[PDB]
Tab-separated table of C-alpha atoms and ligand atoms in Angstrom:
chain	number	residue	atom	x	y	z
A	1	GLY	CA	0.000	0.000	0.000
A	2	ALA	CA	0.920	3.678	-0.335
A	3	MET	CA	1.421	4.293	3.386
A	4	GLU	CA	1.664	2.304	6.602
A	5	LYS	CA	-1.286	2.824	8.938
A	6	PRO	CA	-0.066	4.328	12.239
A	7	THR	CA	-0.636	1.873	15.060
A	8	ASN	CA	-2.722	4.457	16.960
A	9	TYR	CA	-4.804	5.612	13.978
A	10	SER	CA	-8.445	5.979	14.983
A	11	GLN	CA	-11.236	8.529	15.122
A	12	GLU	CA	-10.253	9.380	18.713
A	13	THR	CA	-6.600	9.929	17.820
A	14	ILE	CA	-7.537	12.238	14.936
A	15	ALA	CA	-9.859	14.147	17.285
A	16	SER	CA	-7.028	14.591	19.809
A	17	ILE	CA	-4.676	15.859	17.098
A	18	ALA	CA	-7.282	18.248	15.726
A	19	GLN	CA	-8.000	19.752	19.157
A	20	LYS	CA	-4.283	20.008	19.975
A	21	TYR	CA	-3.423	21.936	16.797
A	22	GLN	CA	-6.557	24.068	17.007
A	23	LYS	CA	-5.201	25.502	20.251
A	24	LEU	CA	-1.643	25.784	18.927
A	25	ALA	CA	-2.887	27.684	15.869
A	26	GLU	CA	-4.656	30.131	18.191
A	27	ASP	CA	-1.463	30.539	20.223
A	28	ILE	CA	0.672	31.085	17.114
A	29	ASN	CA	-1.781	33.507	15.513
A	30	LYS	CA	-1.592	35.874	18.496
A	31	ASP	CA	1.842	36.821	17.083
A	32	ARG	CA	1.125	36.551	13.334
A	33	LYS	CA	-0.016	39.874	11.874
A	34	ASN	CA	-0.590	39.026	8.204
A	35	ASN	CA	-2.923	36.969	6.022
A	36	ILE	CA	-1.482	34.533	3.484
A	37	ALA	CA	-4.218	35.491	0.991
A	38	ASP	CA	-2.887	39.081	1.005
A	39	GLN	CA	0.410	37.871	-0.495
A	40	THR	CA	1.121	36.791	-4.046
A	41	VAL	CA	3.248	33.670	-3.764
A	42	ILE	CA	5.508	32.058	-6.376
A	43	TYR	CA	6.830	28.520	-5.867
A	44	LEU	CA	9.820	28.355	-8.220
A	45	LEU	CA	11.255	24.863	-8.721
A	46	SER	CA	14.599	25.573	-10.407
A	47	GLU	CA	15.362	22.317	-12.215
A	48	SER	CA	18.576	20.653	-11.091
A	49	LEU	CA	19.904	23.790	-9.358
A	50	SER	CA	22.534	23.161	-6.698
A	51	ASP	CA	25.782	24.949	-5.934
A	52	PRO	CA	28.659	22.796	-7.234
A	53	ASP	CA	30.916	24.357	-4.579
A	54	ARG	CA	29.358	21.994	-2.012
A	55	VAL	CA	30.596	18.935	-3.930
A	56	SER	CA	33.861	18.207	-2.143
A	57	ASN	CA	36.057	17.054	-5.022
A	58	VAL	CA	34.884	19.658	-7.567
A	59	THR	CA	36.703	22.839	-8.563
A	60	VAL	CA	35.047	25.620	-10.586
A	61	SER	CA	37.097	28.460	-12.062
A	62	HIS	CA	34.492	31.060	-11.057
A	63	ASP	CA	31.584	31.370	-8.673
A	64	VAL	CA	28.530	30.593	-10.818
A	65	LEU	CA	25.883	31.422	-8.205
A	66	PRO	CA	27.153	34.777	-6.843
A	67	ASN	CA	23.781	36.537	-7.054
A	68	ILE	CA	21.866	33.611	-5.577
A	69	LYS	CA	24.390	33.346	-2.756
A	70	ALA	CA	23.881	37.040	-2.033
A	71	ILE	CA	20.114	36.528	-2.015
A	72	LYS	CA	20.496	33.614	0.415
A	73	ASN	CA	22.564	35.813	2.730
A	74	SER	CA	19.788	38.460	2.751
A	75	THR	CA	16.720	36.392	3.588
A	76	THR	CA	15.488	33.100	4.978
A	77	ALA	CA	17.519	30.516	3.106
A	78	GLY	CA	19.604	27.398	3.392
A	79	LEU	CA	19.783	23.837	2.144
A	80	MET	CA	16.886	21.592	1.165
A	81	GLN	CA	17.100	17.838	1.541
A	82	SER	CA	15.998	16.179	-1.700
A	83	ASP	CA	14.555	12.681	-1.898
A	84	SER	CA	16.363	11.743	-5.123
A	85	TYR	CA	19.356	12.380	-7.372
A	86	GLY	CA	19.283	13.352	-11.040
A	87	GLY	CA	15.501	13.274	-11.163
A	88	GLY	CA	12.357	13.219	-9.070
A	89	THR	CA	11.100	16.751	-9.816
A	90	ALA	CA	7.399	16.044	-9.448
A	91	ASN	CA	7.893	14.357	-6.059
A	92	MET	CA	9.527	17.466	-4.602
A	93	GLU	CA	6.811	19.526	-6.294
A	94	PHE	CA	4.023	17.495	-4.646
A	95	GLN	CA	5.652	17.957	-1.248
A	96	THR	CA	5.880	21.734	-1.630
A	97	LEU	CA	2.193	21.998	-2.470
A	98	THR	CA	0.715	19.554	0.063
A	99	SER	CA	3.439	19.646	2.754
A	100	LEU	CA	3.086	15.866	3.140
A	101	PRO	CA	6.604	14.352	3.261
A	102	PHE	CA	7.603	11.609	0.856
A	103	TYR	CA	9.619	10.011	3.651
A	104	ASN	CA	6.364	9.039	5.415
A	105	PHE	CA	4.947	7.186	2.419
A	106	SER	CA	5.797	3.602	1.547
A	107	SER	CA	9.097	2.935	-0.194
A	108	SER	CA	7.015	1.222	-2.896
A	109	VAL	CA	5.770	4.635	-4.090
A	110	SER	CA	7.664	5.940	-7.111
A	111	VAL	CA	5.735	9.044	-8.249
A	112	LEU	CA	3.395	10.821	-5.836
A	113	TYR	CA	1.377	12.546	-8.560
A	114	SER	CA	0.529	9.146	-10.094
A	115	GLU	CA	0.193	6.910	-7.023
A	116	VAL	CA	-0.905	9.141	-4.117
A	117	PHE	CA	-2.468	12.347	-5.452
A	118	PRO	CA	-5.287	10.534	-7.348
A	119	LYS	CA	-6.303	8.719	-4.182
A	120	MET	CA	-6.704	11.889	-2.089
A	121	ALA	CA	-10.395	12.654	-1.668
A	122	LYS	CA	-9.868	16.368	-0.954
A	123	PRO	CA	-6.203	17.399	-1.293
A	124	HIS	CA	-5.214	20.428	0.793
A	125	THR	CA	-2.500	22.688	-0.628
A	126	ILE	CA	-1.196	26.247	-0.337
A	127	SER	CA	-3.126	27.108	-3.508
A	128	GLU	CA	-6.572	26.624	-1.938
A	129	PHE	CA	-6.379	30.015	-0.195
A	130	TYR	CA	-6.328	31.750	-3.602
A	131	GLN	CA	-9.214	32.175	-6.008
A	132	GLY	CA	-9.200	29.585	-8.764
A	133	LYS	CA	-8.872	32.359	-11.364
A	134	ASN	CA	-5.601	33.390	-9.640
A	135	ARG	CA	-3.909	29.968	-9.536
A	136	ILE	CA	-1.326	29.626	-12.314
A	137	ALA	CA	1.013	26.745	-13.187
A	138	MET	CA	3.918	26.981	-15.638
A	139	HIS	CA	6.294	24.383	-17.094
A	140	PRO	CA	8.083	24.492	-20.498
A	141	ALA	CA	7.424	20.905	-21.565
A	142	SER	CA	4.303	18.780	-21.943
A	143	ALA	CA	1.588	19.532	-19.406
A	144	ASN	CA	0.991	15.756	-19.232
A	145	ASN	CA	4.483	14.870	-18.050
A	146	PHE	CA	4.231	13.391	-14.541
A	147	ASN	CA	0.439	13.749	-14.631
A	148	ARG	CA	0.728	17.500	-13.987
A	149	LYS	CA	-2.257	18.546	-16.114
A	150	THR	CA	-4.575	16.266	-14.144
A	151	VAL	CA	-3.120	17.458	-10.842
A	152	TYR	CA	-3.409	21.179	-11.574
A	153	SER	CA	-6.876	20.710	-13.094
A	154	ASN	CA	-8.077	18.929	-9.961
A	155	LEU	CA	-6.491	21.692	-7.870
A	156	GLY	CA	-8.695	24.134	-9.778
A	157	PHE	CA	-5.944	26.070	-11.530
A	158	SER	CA	-7.087	28.555	-14.139
A	159	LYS	CA	-3.952	28.422	-16.271
A	160	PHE	CA	-1.172	25.921	-16.937
A	161	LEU	CA	1.375	27.368	-19.349
A	162	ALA	CA	3.149	24.535	-21.129
A	163	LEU	CA	4.988	23.927	-24.389
A	164	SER	CA	2.272	21.427	-25.303
A	165	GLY	CA	-0.848	19.827	-23.941
A	166	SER	CA	-2.547	22.979	-22.625
A	167	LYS	CA	-4.396	25.937	-24.080
A	168	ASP	CA	-1.965	28.243	-22.245
A	169	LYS	CA	1.313	29.089	-23.991
A	170	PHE	CA	4.576	30.783	-23.138
A	171	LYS	CA	5.291	33.960	-25.078
A	172	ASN	CA	8.617	34.980	-26.618
A	173	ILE	CA	10.228	31.578	-26.162
A	174	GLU	CA	14.019	31.441	-26.327
A	175	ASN	CA	16.427	28.640	-25.502
A	176	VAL	CA	19.554	28.973	-23.370
A	177	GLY	CA	21.276	25.660	-23.840
A	178	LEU	CA	19.128	23.033	-25.516
A	179	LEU	CA	15.923	23.837	-23.583
A	180	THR	CA	13.656	26.761	-22.740
A	181	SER	CA	15.549	29.494	-20.931
A	182	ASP	CA	14.850	30.543	-17.360
A	183	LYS	CA	14.665	34.102	-18.743
A	184	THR	CA	11.632	33.009	-20.776
A	185	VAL	CA	10.017	31.500	-17.680
A	186	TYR	CA	10.721	34.538	-15.489
A	187	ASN	CA	9.454	37.014	-18.080
A	188	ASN	CA	6.280	34.990	-18.550
A	189	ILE	CA	5.699	35.096	-14.772
A	190	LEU	CA	6.192	38.872	-14.806
A	191	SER	CA	3.713	39.335	-17.667
A	192	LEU	CA	1.007	37.484	-15.706
A	193	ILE	CA	1.470	39.227	-12.342
A	194	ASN	CA	-1.617	41.342	-11.659
A	195	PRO	CA	-1.103	43.693	-8.684
A	196	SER	CA	-4.897	43.962	-8.247
A	197	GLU	CA	-5.079	40.271	-7.306
A	198	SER	CA	-3.441	37.844	-4.903
A	199	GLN	CA	-2.005	35.075	-7.067
A	200	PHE	CA	-0.360	31.702	-6.527
A	201	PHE	CA	2.157	30.514	-9.111
A	202	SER	CA	3.582	26.998	-9.281
A	203	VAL	CA	6.548	27.106	-11.652
A	204	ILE	CA	8.786	24.265	-12.829
A	205	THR	CA	11.728	25.315	-14.971
A	206	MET	CA	13.476	23.292	-17.667
A	207	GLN	CA	16.653	25.146	-18.697
A	208	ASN	CA	19.103	23.172	-16.521
A	209	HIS	CA	17.608	19.739	-17.156
A	210	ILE	CA	19.907	17.062	-18.557
A	211	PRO	CA	21.476	17.052	-21.210
A	212	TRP	CA	23.592	20.176	-20.669
A	213	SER	CA	25.005	21.975	-23.715
A	214	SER	CA	26.808	25.297	-23.395
A	215	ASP	CA	30.076	26.625	-24.804
A	216	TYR	CA	29.948	30.068	-23.160
A	217	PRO	CA	31.008	31.750	-20.952
A	218	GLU	CA	34.182	29.946	-22.041
A	219	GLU	CA	36.104	31.284	-19.041
A	220	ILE	CA	33.902	29.122	-16.791
A	221	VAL	CA	35.577	25.718	-16.563
A	222	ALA	CA	35.050	23.001	-13.980
A	223	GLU	CA	36.696	19.726	-13.114
A	224	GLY	CA	36.375	17.016	-10.513
A	225	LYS	CA	39.033	14.812	-8.954
A	226	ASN	CA	39.475	11.690	-11.087
A	227	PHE	CA	36.551	12.700	-13.286
A	228	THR	CA	36.285	11.371	-16.811
A	229	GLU	CA	36.401	13.813	-19.714
A	230	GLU	CA	32.624	13.439	-20.075
A	231	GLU	CA	31.990	14.127	-16.388
A	232	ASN	CA	34.170	17.250	-16.532
A	233	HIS	CA	32.461	18.433	-19.721
A	234	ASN	CA	28.981	17.940	-18.276
A	235	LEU	CA	29.972	19.770	-15.096
A	236	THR	CA	31.444	22.643	-17.119
A	237	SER	CA	28.360	22.925	-19.341
A	238	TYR	CA	26.084	22.785	-16.287
A	239	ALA	CA	28.123	25.449	-14.461
A	240	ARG	CA	27.907	27.733	-17.502
A	241	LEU	CA	24.129	27.249	-17.603
A	242	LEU	CA	23.907	28.028	-13.882
A	243	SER	CA	25.680	31.339	-14.520
A	244	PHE	CA	22.771	32.425	-16.754
A	245	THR	CA	20.168	31.270	-14.246
A	246	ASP	CA	22.020	33.185	-11.555
A	247	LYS	CA	21.965	36.481	-13.461
A	248	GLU	CA	18.378	36.037	-14.649
A	249	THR	CA	17.171	35.217	-11.117
A	250	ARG	CA	18.640	38.486	-9.837
A	251	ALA	CA	17.000	40.410	-12.695
A	252	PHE	CA	13.672	38.706	-11.972
A	253	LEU	CA	13.719	39.620	-8.288
A	254	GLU	CA	14.737	43.211	-9.125
A	255	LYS	CA	11.606	43.454	-11.287
A	256	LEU	CA	9.462	42.038	-8.487
A	257	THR	CA	10.659	44.811	-6.161
A	258	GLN	CA	9.061	47.354	-8.520
A	259	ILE	CA	5.575	45.773	-8.382
A	260	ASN	CA	3.155	47.365	-5.906
A	261	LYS	CA	1.931	44.087	-4.368
A	262	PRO	CA	3.445	41.948	-1.577
A	263	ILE	CA	5.133	39.050	-3.409
A	264	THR	CA	7.084	36.143	-1.894
A	265	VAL	CA	9.151	33.630	-3.874
A	266	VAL	CA	10.032	30.156	-2.602
A	267	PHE	CA	13.005	29.234	-4.817
A	268	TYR	CA	14.688	25.842	-4.672
A	269	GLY	CA	16.561	23.256	-6.652
A	270	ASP	CA	14.683	19.968	-6.797
A	271	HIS	CA	17.768	17.677	-6.793
A	272	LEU	CA	21.392	17.732	-7.893
A	273	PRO	CA	22.105	17.223	-11.603
A	274	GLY	CA	22.859	13.597	-12.391
A	275	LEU	CA	26.393	14.199	-13.582
A	276	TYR	CA	28.615	13.497	-10.566
A	277	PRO	CA	30.128	10.117	-9.711
A	278	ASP	CA	29.731	9.077	-6.088
A	279	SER	CA	33.461	9.673	-5.593
A	280	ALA	CA	32.813	13.415	-6.051
A	281	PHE	CA	31.261	13.605	-2.568
A	282	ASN	CA	34.338	12.233	-0.733
A	283	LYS	CA	32.892	10.875	2.544
A	284	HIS	CA	30.296	13.702	2.630
A	285	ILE	CA	27.657	11.718	0.741
A	286	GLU	CA	24.902	13.766	2.376
A	287	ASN	CA	25.778	16.471	-0.180
A	288	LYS	CA	24.450	14.250	-2.973
A	289	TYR	CA	20.951	15.224	-1.735
A	290	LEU	CA	21.311	18.852	-0.562
A	291	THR	CA	20.157	21.663	-2.861
A	292	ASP	CA	19.807	25.425	-2.307
A	293	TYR	CA	16.635	27.231	-1.313
A	294	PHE	CA	15.559	30.732	-0.390
A	295	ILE	CA	12.309	32.412	0.630
A	296	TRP	CA	12.399	36.045	-0.534
A	297	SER	CA	9.775	38.820	-0.378
A	298	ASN	CA	9.815	41.979	-2.475
A	299	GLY	CA	9.734	44.276	0.556
A	300	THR	CA	11.610	43.881	3.834
A	301	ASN	CA	12.907	40.392	4.582
A	302	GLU	CA	13.539	38.707	7.873
A	303	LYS	CA	16.103	35.899	7.933
A	304	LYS	CA	14.668	32.985	9.907
A	305	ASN	CA	17.113	30.281	10.983
A	306	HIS	CA	16.362	27.147	8.933
A	307	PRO	CA	19.714	25.891	7.617
A	308	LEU	CA	18.413	22.479	6.494
A	309	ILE	CA	14.768	21.697	5.741
A	310	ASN	CA	12.732	19.384	3.526
A	311	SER	CA	10.690	20.293	0.461
A	312	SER	CA	7.543	19.496	2.473
A	313	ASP	CA	8.465	22.242	4.972
A	314	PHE	CA	8.310	25.161	2.528
A	315	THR	CA	4.700	26.179	3.209
A	316	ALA	CA	5.161	26.338	6.976
A	317	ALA	CA	8.356	28.293	6.393
A	318	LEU	CA	6.487	30.619	4.028
A	319	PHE	CA	3.834	31.366	6.637
A	320	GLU	CA	6.562	32.093	9.187
A	321	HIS	CA	8.608	34.268	6.822
A	322	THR	CA	5.569	36.351	5.868
A	323	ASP	CA	4.204	36.399	9.475
A	324	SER	CA	0.907	34.929	8.244
A	325	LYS	CA	-1.744	33.333	10.438
A	326	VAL	CA	-1.938	29.541	10.308
A	327	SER	CA	-4.575	26.866	10.184
A	328	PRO	CA	-4.290	23.995	12.672
A	329	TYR	CA	-2.781	21.965	9.812
A	330	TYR	CA	-0.064	24.603	9.281
A	331	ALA	CA	0.454	24.854	13.059
A	332	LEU	CA	1.312	21.137	13.031
A	333	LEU	CA	3.525	21.705	9.994
A	334	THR	CA	5.237	24.576	11.834
A	335	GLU	CA	6.004	22.165	14.688
A	336	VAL	CA	7.421	19.761	12.083
A	337	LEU	CA	9.517	22.521	10.492
A	338	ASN	CA	10.981	23.589	13.824
A	339	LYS	CA	11.194	20.383	15.847
A	340	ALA	CA	10.698	17.232	13.780
A	341	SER	CA	12.131	17.556	10.282
A	342	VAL	CA	15.153	16.251	8.367
A	343	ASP	CA	17.711	18.267	10.346
A	344	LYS	CA	16.750	16.393	13.543
A	345	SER	CA	17.435	12.810	14.557
A	346	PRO	CA	14.589	10.455	13.553
A	347	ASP	CA	15.241	8.547	16.806
A	348	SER	CA	14.546	11.616	18.951
A	349	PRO	CA	11.434	11.125	21.115
A	350	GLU	CA	10.229	14.647	20.382
A	351	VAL	CA	10.695	14.126	16.640
A	352	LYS	CA	8.809	10.833	16.832
A	353	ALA	CA	5.922	12.326	18.809
A	354	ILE	CA	5.344	15.142	16.326
A	355	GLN	CA	5.826	12.741	13.403
A	356	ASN	CA	3.130	10.504	14.887
A	357	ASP	CA	0.771	13.488	14.782
A	358	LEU	CA	1.777	14.117	11.159
A	359	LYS	CA	1.566	10.469	10.065
A	360	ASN	CA	-1.988	10.139	11.387
A	361	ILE	CA	-3.056	13.257	9.450
A	362	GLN	CA	-1.146	12.156	6.347
A	363	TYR	CA	-2.706	8.703	6.437
A	364	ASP	CA	-6.169	10.105	7.105
A	365	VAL	CA	-6.138	12.326	4.008
A	366	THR	CA	-4.561	9.804	1.605
A	367	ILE	CA	-5.625	6.178	1.995
A	368	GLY	CA	-7.312	6.409	5.406
A	369	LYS	CA	-10.869	7.002	6.555
A	370	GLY	CA	-11.222	10.782	6.241
A	371	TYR	CA	-11.920	11.271	9.940
A	372	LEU	CA	-10.814	14.887	9.528
A	373	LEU	CA	-14.061	15.616	7.643
A	374	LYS	CA	-15.686	15.957	11.070
A	375	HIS	CA	-13.115	18.578	12.166
A	376	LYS	CA	-14.271	21.438	9.989
A	377	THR	CA	-11.714	24.061	11.072
A	378	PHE	CA	-8.593	21.890	10.863
A	379	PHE	CA	-7.582	23.228	7.442
A	380	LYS	CA	-9.127	26.682	7.892
A	381	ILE	CA	-7.133	29.712	8.979
B	1	LIG	O1	14.172	16.057	-13.412
B	1	LIG	P1	13.007	15.097	-13.837
B	1	LIG	O2	12.539	14.103	-12.752
B	1	LIG	O3	13.414	14.327	-15.130
B	1	LIG	O4	11.639	15.887	-14.204
B	1	LIG	C1	11.548	16.533	-15.477
B	1	LIG	C2	10.118	16.977	-15.748
B	1	LIG	O5	9.772	18.072	-14.874
B	1	LIG	C3	9.939	17.360	-17.201
B	1	LIG	O6	8.570	17.530	-17.563
B	2	LIG	CA1	5.345	37.797	14.406
B	3	LIG	MN1	14.254	17.673	-11.840
């Protein structure tokens, strides 16, 4: 099955969890001034983006993420633990939207959008707080890859810009490398931002997807210890492509600062590019699964301390960064973010206690009994 049933799963356990997080949400909201629905929010999955400087045995002639590193220094930012290497985009994507961690589902599950999403009777996501007309998805490939068209349709999205398979198209398409440039994606976001509305964007880039082809900037060269010629060439091409993403990401944020609407971007790489041999990580194999993320608003930014989080934690972190009031569900997810996520020991009693709360909710809304249907305020702010 898709998930193990918690040993204490029952109507009474779900009731206890719902009452517990109802009170915690009230406690949290006493110190949260803002409303999430007053913010336009962009979830920006930057395909295969991850600083090569963290790969121990790699040397790059130049810093290829200088602007993104400066952004990370200025706002809530850190490392994201990914569930896969060289692929798995849609699984990280699912976790950002639902906040349900892949690590709590069965190891038999390969793709959440195909095996778990269709079984959810009433999937709760960050997008539900926005009007359907203001929910926009964007991905420069087929809308049907990884079942995305079905997912975004069932989430009530008004638009899904795709290269094929949707009525919604990207404008002024240009390639940087072999695939659609990040500049194209960013400029298409900007053209759809409507300051008179609160909008939710779910964006999945393609520029830095395998295979990597770039001859310039020629001064950017990269090598790894004992790498083959092919490995070094792929790393060099990838680093060159990152340099464009880095500059275009800065230019994108600069444009967002000039829009008279509160806008927050959750930016993250989904997984490392699948070009490094295991030897590249030299006894620090954890770095095979650690990408960069930041959470940046177009006004004043706090910098909350979250050096290592999971993709499923982004929504709770977004509420905290924007000082937005939470539902009981997001109160639980805030407890996960702070006390029970991937930076903590899974053997810690506190981690296990909070994870038991989460697993019961996660089971209930996927393949369980839907006991939460009787707790009408659990997902409400
Ligand atoms: O990185 P992967 O898992 O191949 O995902 C690519 C997919 O988003 C293309 O439509
Ligand atoms: Ca506050
Ligand atoms: Mn990917």
